[PDB]
Design a protein around this motif. Structure first.
Motif, PDB file in Angstrom:
ATOM      1  N   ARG B  32      36.449   2.505  88.331  1.00 32.28           N
ATOM      2  CA  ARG B  32      35.673   1.937  87.233  1.00 32.28           C
ATOM      3  C   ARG B  32      36.091   0.508  86.870  1.00 32.28           C
ATOM      4  O   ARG B  32      35.230  -0.337  86.595  1.00 32.28           O
ATOM      5  CB  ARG B  32      35.700   2.866  86.009  1.00 32.28           C
TER       6      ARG B  32
ATOM      7  N   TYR C  97      22.472 -12.387  75.034  1.00 22.36           N
ATOM      8  CA  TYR C  97      23.117 -12.178  73.735  1.00 22.36           C
ATOM      9  C   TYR C  97      22.180 -12.432  72.542  1.00 22.36           C
ATOM     10  O   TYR C  97      22.232 -11.708  71.532  1.00 22.36           O
ATOM     11  CB  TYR C  97      24.392 -12.996  73.625  1.00 22.36           C
ATOM     12  N   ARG C 100      19.883  -9.397  72.388  1.00 27.32           N
ATOM     13  CA  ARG C 100      20.675  -8.276  71.852  1.00 27.32           C
ATOM     14  C   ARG C 100      20.746  -8.354  70.327  1.00 27.32           C
ATOM     15  O   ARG C 100      20.489  -7.363  69.645  1.00 27.32           O
ATOM     16  CB  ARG C 100      22.100  -8.234  72.441  1.00 27.32           C
ATOM     17  N   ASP C 134      26.243  -6.710  80.782  1.00 29.78           N
ATOM     18  CA  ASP C 134      27.288  -6.208  81.584  1.00 29.78           C
ATOM     19  C   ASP C 134      27.304  -6.749  83.009  1.00 29.78           C
ATOM     20  O   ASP C 134      28.309  -7.158  83.497  1.00 29.78           O
ATOM     21  CB  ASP C 134      27.307  -4.708  81.599  1.00 29.78           C
ATOM     22  N   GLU C 137      28.325 -10.587  82.819  1.00 28.06           N
ATOM     23  CA  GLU C 137      29.762 -10.733  82.542  1.00 28.06           C
ATOM     24  C   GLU C 137      30.612 -10.402  83.763  1.00 28.06           C
ATOM     25  O   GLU C 137      31.601 -11.084  84.031  1.00 28.06           O
ATOM     26  CB  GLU C 137      30.181  -9.858  81.363  1.00 28.06           C
TER      27      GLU C 137
ATOM     28  N   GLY F   1      30.389 -15.027  72.992  1.00 29.28           N
ATOM     29  CA  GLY F   1      29.999 -13.680  73.525  1.00 29.28           C
ATOM     30  C   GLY F   1      29.360 -12.858  72.421  1.00 29.28           C
ATOM     31  O   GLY F   1      28.445 -13.338  71.744  1.00 29.28           O
ATOM     32  N   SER F   2      29.803 -11.612  72.240  1.00 26.98           N
ATOM     33  CA  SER F   2      30.696 -10.915  73.179  1.00 26.98           C
ATOM     34  C   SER F   2      30.437  -9.399  73.100  1.00 26.98           C
ATOM     35  O   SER F   2      29.826  -8.917  72.129  1.00 26.98           O
ATOM     36  CB  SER F   2      32.179 -11.263  72.944  1.00 26.98           C
ATOM     37  N   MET F   3      30.889  -8.666  74.122  1.00 25.51           N
ATOM     38  CA  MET F   3      30.736  -7.203  74.192  1.00 25.51           C
ATOM     39  C   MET F   3      31.898  -6.456  73.576  1.00 25.51           C
ATOM     40  O   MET F   3      31.892  -5.216  73.558  1.00 25.51           O
ATOM     41  CB  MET F   3      30.549  -6.731  75.640  1.00 25.51           C
ATOM     42  N   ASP F  62      32.885   4.408  81.503  1.00 28.51           N
ATOM     43  CA  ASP F  62      31.991   3.254  81.763  1.00 28.51           C
ATOM     44  C   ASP F  62      31.724   2.506  80.447  1.00 28.51           C
ATOM     45  O   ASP F  62      31.877   1.271  80.376  1.00 28.51           O
ATOM     46  CB  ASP F  62      30.698   3.772  82.424  1.00 28.51           C
ATOM     47  N   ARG F  63      31.358   3.247  79.397  1.00 31.74           N
ATOM     48  CA  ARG F  63      31.080   2.602  78.095  1.00 31.74           C
ATOM     49  C   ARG F  63      32.307   1.907  77.506  1.00 31.74           C
ATOM     50  O   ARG F  63      32.203   0.772  76.991  1.00 31.74           O
ATOM     51  CB  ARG F  63      30.491   3.622  77.113  1.00 31.74           C
ATOM     52  N   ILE F  65      34.855   0.563  79.028  1.00 28.53           N
ATOM     53  CA  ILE F  65      35.089  -0.691  79.752  1.00 28.53           C
ATOM     54  C   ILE F  65      34.052  -1.759  79.417  1.00 28.53           C
ATOM     55  O   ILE F  65      34.399  -2.949  79.297  1.00 28.53           O
ATOM     56  CB  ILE F  65      35.179  -0.434  81.283  1.00 28.53           C
ATOM     57  N   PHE F  66      32.799  -1.358  79.244  1.00 30.27           N
ATOM     58  CA  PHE F  66      31.781  -2.320  78.814  1.00 30.27           C
ATOM     59  C   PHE F  66      32.120  -2.973  77.470  1.00 30.27           C
ATOM     60  O   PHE F  66      31.877  -4.176  77.257  1.00 30.27           O
ATOM     61  CB  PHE F  66      30.429  -1.675  78.685  1.00 30.27           C
ATOM     62  N   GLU F  68      35.014  -3.577  76.458  1.00 32.22           N
ATOM     63  CA  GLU F  68      36.305  -4.240  76.684  1.00 32.22           C
ATOM     64  C   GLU F  68      37.481  -3.493  76.078  1.00 32.22           C
ATOM     65  O   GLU F  68      38.482  -4.091  75.693  1.00 32.22           O
ATOM     66  CB  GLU F  68      36.246  -5.730  76.273  1.00 32.22           C
ATOM     67  N   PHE F  70      40.261   0.025  76.583  1.00 23.94           N
ATOM     68  CA  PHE F  70      41.014   0.603  77.679  1.00 23.94           C
ATOM     69  C   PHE F  70      40.886   2.130  77.685  1.00 23.94           C
ATOM     70  O   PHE F  70      41.366   2.787  76.763  1.00 23.94           O
ATOM     71  CB  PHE F  70      42.484   0.211  77.595  1.00 23.94           C
ATOM     72  N   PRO F  71      40.243   2.699  78.723  1.00 16.04           N
ATOM     73  CA  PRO F  71      40.073   4.159  78.745  1.00 16.04           C
ATOM     74  C   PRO F  71      41.406   4.867  78.950  1.00 16.04           C
ATOM     75  O   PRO F  71      42.186   4.452  79.814  1.00 16.04           O
ATOM     76  CB  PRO F  71      39.194   4.392  79.988  1.00 16.04           C
TER      77      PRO F  71
END
Ligand code: HEM
Ligand code: HEM
Ligand code: HEM
Ligand code: HEM
Ligand SMILES: [Cl-]
Ligand SMILES: [Cl-]
Ligand SMILES: [Cl-]
Ligand SMILES: [Cl-]
Ligand SMILES: [Fe+3]
Ligand SMILES: [Fe+3]
Ligand SMILES: [Fe+3]
Ligand SMILES: [Fe+3]
Ligand SMILES: [Fe+3]
Ligand SMILES: [Fe+3]
Ligand SMILES: [Fe+3]
Ligand SMILES: [Fe+3]
Ligand SMILES: [Fe+3]
Ligand SMILES: [Fe+3]
Ligand SMILES: [Fe+3]
Ligand SMILES: [Mg+2]
Ligand SMILES: [Mg+2]
Ligand SMILES: [Mg+2]
Ligand SMILES: [Mg+2]
Ligand SMILES: [Mg+2]
Ligand SMILES: [Mg+2]
Ligand SMILES: [Mg+2]
Ligand SMILES: [Mg+2]
Ligand SMILES: [Mg+2]
Ligand SMILES: [Mg+2]
Ligand SMILES: [Mg+2]
Ligand SMILES: [Mg+2]
Ligand SMILES: [Mg+2]
Ligand SMILES: [Mg+2]
Ligand SMILES: [Mg+2]
Ligand SMILES: [Mg+2]
Ligand SMILES: [Mg+2]
Ligand SMILES: [Mg+2]
Ligand SMILES: [Mg+2]
Ligand code: NA
Ligand code: NA
Ligand code: NA
Lengths: 161, 161, 161, 161, 161, 161, 161
Positions: B32, C97, C100, C134, C137, F1-3, F62-63, F65-66, F68, F70-71
């Motif tokens: 991932r 962005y 969004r 995604d 980026e 940004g940003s996510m 997955d979500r 990480i999108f 940003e 840490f899983p």
């Protein structure tokens, strides 16, 4: 790390490669001689056996490199070359018994030194060589019972083939 | 009866399961992360490796239950998580060397305790892990020789894929 | 009746259409520029993205008419046009962005005014735009790590294609 | 070199693009309105016409970039939007006559300035637009002769389609 | 546990079922009447719509039972039965506006009581009913513009079908 | 940004991952135990359910990480492991009720913090878990009515399968 | 030469053959009895198991002859014949535990005497027999939990099959 193999294991792998390269060449030459002599059926079997030993040599080269050793393909084991059908079978058989003894010693060395994956490779080769020994002993038994000339006829093709 | 396994053998099987569950998760997370970073080709390989370790874990669970032991899936071994491509390969490689050492010790314990079928399972796992070690060492050698940026490019897909 | 929409909901739908039409045209121009520059793989992706925004525009037009409002296709949002690959990706990302933010505000307005079907449409668009964000980026991360010239090469085709 | 186009030719190409982008949007909106009104057959034709003008716009963008000019997709020509079937056809027809006049002037300018390939592009567009003019004049003639209500019925689908 | 639903949510689900069963029967009767009257194309559409409402009823019954409530199929909502084509469309449209209002109220109640899965079900039904409303408003618009007799003709089959 | 996600949203995603990893392992162990016990049909269902939770875990990773974040795959939620068929079903059901409560809380937190795409993900998981709850409650109801021994028989295969 | 096997290895191979021939016959008779009793599904499995032991016997005969020993097919090991379903499973299970103990001792003897290929044959047989032990223990566990009469029903076919 490390994959660095025991020097003695790499030595045993290189001994097996020396024998395998000898067998490749002995079987290839026997194929070509048997063909020239007219025993086309046995010649075909001999060619197949050479190719099988080519696969053994490849497995050994691969393992040596994994262990970070250097495979030696510069020399090949002494060839035993027959001058008639019975001598070809006998020559091959002696070569197979030599390889059998070598692989038995080598599997024990790998076991003792804790390289179980290399030990398993020698176990696979050992089973393969015992199979070939059994084939050859059978041919030599058949040749003895029906006579060399009938064995030769059995293993030759007619002129139109 | 009885199929009741030696406690020490079941212990070794549970140690292997702990390591296998760690590897599943480390490879899945690396898949991932690599994907998010753009290295889609390496990410695909990492996903396949995680699935292979899932099969190992399943084989171990199955054997534990056959021996009338209790498989432990409550905990997983410590994860090594890389923050760039070279660190991901290094992290995986260290994990593979740990599993290799564990399975070598475990096959010897099973042999000594007369559980030859469990010994054979550790021998199969050992060969599998040495295969993975060889793959990873090769990637790290390639990365060193062509440089990390070219290795990254090699293992990324274009935008339309 | 009636399907007569809230004026403020129709306004939000028309704001989304304005942004979608801008995105269609920005992506289409970026497709043609990238192709002229030799980045045929990234160009193909850009063309696909333009077509996806065409589908968004169509869904918005359809909803506006259902609500008995008048869709505005006379004007398009300000284009951000890049002069190299990195700038094209950055320009697209800023546009995403913006959309969004707009769709997050719009879904809240629809929720507050009791138009749950229009809210669902903004939720669908929002998820789509976060996907694009995604993707972009990730490309910008890859470009940074392997370098712009390797990223360019990765995204160009050979001369015989 | 050089492919650098005449500024006046690039101007004419950008004028054509402005008109083409207007037509795309006018036909798309007319498609959606006609559909909402129940004239599904005419709506389908209108959607196809919009897509044809999308191809014209693409050809123009491509040519502008070849001439090292900058395509303008920031603005679109004024839309003529009908409020019933006859007005939709009339609005489209007026737009087609405008494009016809523009392309006639533009082919002459390209000819005079020695850009024969751009002249040929305007000749292709001109033939296409005269085809559309002929289609629309025919529809308007038919509508006049059988009456607007029969023309509407002819161009609507039954409820189960 | 438990899946025991809020009484008020089950009440809202049962209210929706009451309306859905009414719609099934109204559309089925309208199918048979329209067919008897000669409007075979509109009749086919009406039969399809009845079957779609049968699927809505089934989804509601399923949800009620999951929430450990008791679905009520003993009564159906008041039918609006038309005596000509325009009245059939108007009757169906009023029924759809009723269901739309009910499902908007119900989704808000589910949201407030924390049953987000039931809320999602009402959201799905709401979108479906707004689609139907759209279809019916379009038919009534077409009928108005081309006239009831042409609308009837458009929606009837020739005698040999 | 940003996510960059809200810390509290990432926390909720990581809480869901913790529960999903627990469910994967509980279902996998229950699959292997049920198989050992002879309940091969229920065992097959349990394996399928584990794989479905693997897909949930992947969506959450997955979500995270999108956004940003840490899983966390280092720890898994406490396993409930049954010692007979009824206990396996009860253990799974308790785990599903836990995940249901968690996802209801998480969707509300995402809604409140304006992360509507993460909210939608929790809504999707919630619907999935309510389905599973339904399945398990039905099995436990059936087991109660026909008796545990008949339920066991129903869910075992004959010896030649 | 020589392929001449160790006398003690040939003895161990002949002991295994004695046990294998017993198993062939016990499983064949159990197949025929189970069939007569109406348990057709279990009877089918028993027939398959007999055929598997026929393959083991063949592998052993082959190896004995390769080692230049004489295979003994004149006698078979004592049969354990059940008089109901539970006793059939118990009888088979006891026979499998006997073979397991024999093959464990035999692999150790072959290892000690340096016949690694024969050792490998005993390792293969050992894994096979542990598989069968696991199957039988599972059946006996299932029979205990659902009761002998339900286990019998599960393993019988209806009259028309
Ligand atoms: C006397 C020397 C050798 C001769 C005359 C010889 C001849 C051949 C021929 C003619 C073939 C292809 C069969 C055909 O298409 O007709 C072949 C295949 C092959 N030679 N070979 C020799 C030595 C070796 C050596 C030293 C290796 C090292 C490993 C080797 C590896 C192989 C392998 C692996 C294949 C089969 C490829 C495959 O199917 O994977 N041959 N050898
Ligand atoms: C991080 C935790 C895990 C994740 C994210 C994960 C993910 C997945 C996914 C997505 C698949 C299906 C591939 C596809 O269809 O796309 C899969 C398959 C599989 N997971 N898995 C996890 C842990 C485990 C564990 C603990 C086991 C225990 C043995 C396991 C056993 C398996 C097996 C055996 C398959 C392949 C099924 C077959 O082909 O026989 N996975 N895992
Ligand atoms: C109102 C604005 C627009 C809308 C609503 C719109 C809608 C669409 C849709 C829906 C499709 C795909 C048809 C389908 O699969 O259903 C399409 C295709 C296409 N849009 N489009 C718009 C503007 C543009 C512009 C400005 C261009 C610039 C050149 C363009 C270029 C194209 C091309 C070339 C295709 C067909 C692709 C092919 O077959 O090569 N569309 N447009
Ligand atoms: C009670 C004594 C035996 C009975 C009743 C029996 C019965 C059978 C039957 C009926 C078949 C064929 C299955 C079919 O076509 O319906 C078979 C196959 C076979 N019997 N068999 C007995 C003993 C043996 C022995 C002592 C051996 C020695 C190795 C043996 C070796 C084999 C093999 C290898 C096959 C399968 C052939 C193949 O697929 O390669 N059977 N036995
Ligand atoms: Cl061994
Ligand atoms: Cl000309
Ligand atoms: Cl919502
Ligand atoms: Cl019963
Ligand atoms: Fe060899
Ligand atoms: Fe070769
Ligand atoms: Fe592993
Ligand atoms: Fe998995
Ligand atoms: Fe969009
Ligand atoms: Fe045009
Ligand atoms: Fe388009
Ligand atoms: Fe409905
Ligand atoms: Fe889940
Ligand atoms: Fe056996
Ligand atoms: Fe047989
Ligand atoms: Mg090293
Ligand atoms: Mg000659
Ligand atoms: Mg390799
Ligand atoms: Mg026991
Ligand atoms: Mg990222
Ligand atoms: Mg099994
Ligand atoms: Mg150029
Ligand atoms: Mg529509
Ligand atoms: Mg130039
Ligand atoms: Mg309308
Ligand atoms: Mg070109
Ligand atoms: Mg009548
Ligand atoms: Mg269901
Ligand atoms: Mg068991
Ligand atoms: Mg993705
Ligand atoms: Mg809300
Ligand atoms: Mg001899
Ligand atoms: Mg009888
Ligand atoms: Mg043989
Ligand atoms: Na003869
Ligand atoms: Na490169
Ligand atoms: Na007419």
């Amino acid at each position: 790390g490390s994959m660095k193999g025991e020097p003695k294991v790499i030595e045993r792998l290189n001994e097996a490669l020396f024998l395998e390269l000898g067998a490749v060449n002995q079987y290839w030459l026997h194929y070509r001689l048997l063909n020239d002599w007219g025993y086309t059926r046995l010649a075909k079997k001999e060619r197949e056996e050479s190719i099988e030993e080519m696969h053994h040599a490849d497995k050994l080269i691969d393992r040596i490199i994994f262990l970070e050793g250097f495979p030696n393909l510069q020399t090949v084991s002494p060839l035993r070359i027959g001058q008639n059908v019975k001598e070809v079978l006998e020559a091959d058989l002696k070569g197979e018994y030599d390889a059998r003894a070598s692989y038995k010693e080598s599997r024990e060395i790998c076991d003792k030194l804790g390289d179980y994956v290399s030990k398993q490779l020698f176990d696979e080769l050992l089973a393969d060589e015992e199979g070939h020994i059994d084939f050859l002993e059978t041919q030599l038994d058949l040749l003895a019972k029906i006579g060399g000339e009938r064995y030769g006829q059995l293993n030759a093709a007619p002129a139109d083939e």
